[PDB]
Amino acid sequence: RAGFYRQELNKTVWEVPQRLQGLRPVGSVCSAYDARLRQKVAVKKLSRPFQSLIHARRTYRELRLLKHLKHENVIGLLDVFTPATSIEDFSEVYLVTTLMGADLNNIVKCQALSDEHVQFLVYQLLRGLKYIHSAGIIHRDLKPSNVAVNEDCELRILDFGATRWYRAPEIMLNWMHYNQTVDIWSVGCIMAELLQGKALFPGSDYIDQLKRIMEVVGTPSPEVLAKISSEHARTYIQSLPPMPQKDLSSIFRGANPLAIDLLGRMLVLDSDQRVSAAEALAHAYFSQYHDPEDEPEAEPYDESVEAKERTLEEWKELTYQEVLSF
Numbered sequence: 023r024a025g026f027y028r029q030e031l032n033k034t035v036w037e038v039p040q041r042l043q044g045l046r047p048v049g050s051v052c053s054a055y056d057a058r059l060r061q062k063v064a065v066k067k068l069s070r071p072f073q074s075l076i077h078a079r080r081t082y083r084e085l086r087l088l089k090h091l092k093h094e095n096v097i098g099l100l101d102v103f104t105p106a107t108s109i110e111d112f113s114e115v116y117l118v119t120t121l122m123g124a125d126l127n128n129i130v131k132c133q134a135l136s137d138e139h140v141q142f143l144v145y146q147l148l149r150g151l152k153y154i155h156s157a158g159i160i161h162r163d164l165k166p167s168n169v170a171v172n173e174d175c176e177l178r179i180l181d182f183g184a185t186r187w188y189r190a191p192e193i194m195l196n197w198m199h200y201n202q203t204v205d206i207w208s209v210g211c212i213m214a215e216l217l218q219g220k221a222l223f224p225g226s227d228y229i230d231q232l233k234r235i236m237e238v239v240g241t242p243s244p245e246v247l248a249k250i251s252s253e254h255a256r257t258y259i260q261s262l263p264p265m266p267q268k269d270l271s272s273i274f275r276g277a278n279p280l281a282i283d284l285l286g287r288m289l290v291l292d293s294d295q296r297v298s299a300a301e302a303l304a305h306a307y308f309s310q311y312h313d314p315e316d317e318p319e320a321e322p323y324d325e326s327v328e329a330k331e332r333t334l335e336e337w338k339e340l341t342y343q344e345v346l347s348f
């Protein structure tokens with residue numbers, strides 16, 4: 023509280039340095055202008071970050087993860103702080119980034135994007151995911167509202183923290199050994215929505231979700247169904263009647279043939295045959311944007327520290343160090 027000040031936004035106290043002016047709650051997340059940095063910034067006050075062990079891990083990970091990942095099309099930390107002068111009164115954490123404007127829903131709602139815009143939006147989303155995947159990280163909840171877009175159509179991936187719309191089958195079916203391509207399914211659901219201007223699989227429940235996915239992508243073979251689901255989850259799919267595969271061209275009428283082609287390589291039930299984030303950029307849909315040189319990978323993410331049992335006070339202190347060291 024040495025140069026900080028207190029408000030109440032979202033009916034909760036917000037202690038921040040005085041450089042941050044004019045907090046308008048977005049969602050807790052608030053807008054603001056930074057006086058020193060002289061630009062628009064967003065701020066994320068973490069909810070009771072050290073009340074529980076899990077909160078302490080999630081508080082640590084988020085911080086560790088945003089610091090590690092540094093890419094154009096990914097969220098990046100401008101600043102981190104606490105209103106705490108010691109480890110005793112360390113109870114609150116605040117993360118700070120650039121204001122990216124709106125989410126991806128706003129763009130679709132307001133303006134039906136051309137095939138030119140769509141090319142550039144998915145390009146960035148893959149180029150960004152290529153970075154994250156290369157780090158050895160999975161989003162597991164890629165969706166419109168976890169993707170910010172600047173007015174220049176600049177894109178950035180984030181994790182705010184329905185989902186099932188853009189969720190891969192094997193996650194719903196509890197495969198428990200799913201890899202990075204779960205997100206590639208999500209990208210397809212997002213990209214399809216960009217074209218049509220409406221959700222591809224707006225399932226009203228768990229079953230209805232699967233019934234919509236099984237109509238377009240069709241019924242999987244018993245061989246393919248056995249490698250994307252637990253023994254218990256299979257009875258949900260077998261319950262459903264036999265439904266044939268639909269040709270995407272008939273769905274996405276008057277779409278770019280290339281765009282339809284790429285969706286066929288993303289919306290696949292077998293994860294082994296889904297396209298890679300890296301491969302997908304090579305596709306002729308992004309021929310206007312693809313640059314092999316300017317599509318960097320990320321550094322391997324060290325799990326070592328996290329992959330170890332510790333008490334709260336250790337997560338508390340470990341975090342304090344990571345805050346201050348920024």
Ligand SMILES: Cc1ccc(-n2nc(C(C)(C)C)cc2NC(=O)Nc2ccc(OCCN3CCOCC3)c3ccccc23)cc1
Nearest residue numbers: 051064065066080084117118119121122123170180181182
């Ligand atoms: C426990 C936990 C662990 C990790 C994460 N996590 N994982 C990722 C990956 C997938 C990209 C690596 C990113 C994040 N964390 C985030 O993306 N955090 C945030 C989300 C939404 C926000 O504000 C959104 C509001 N607004 C949108 C428009 O642009 C300005 C911000 C934020 C505002 C300021 C600071 C951080 C924010 C999240 C939680």
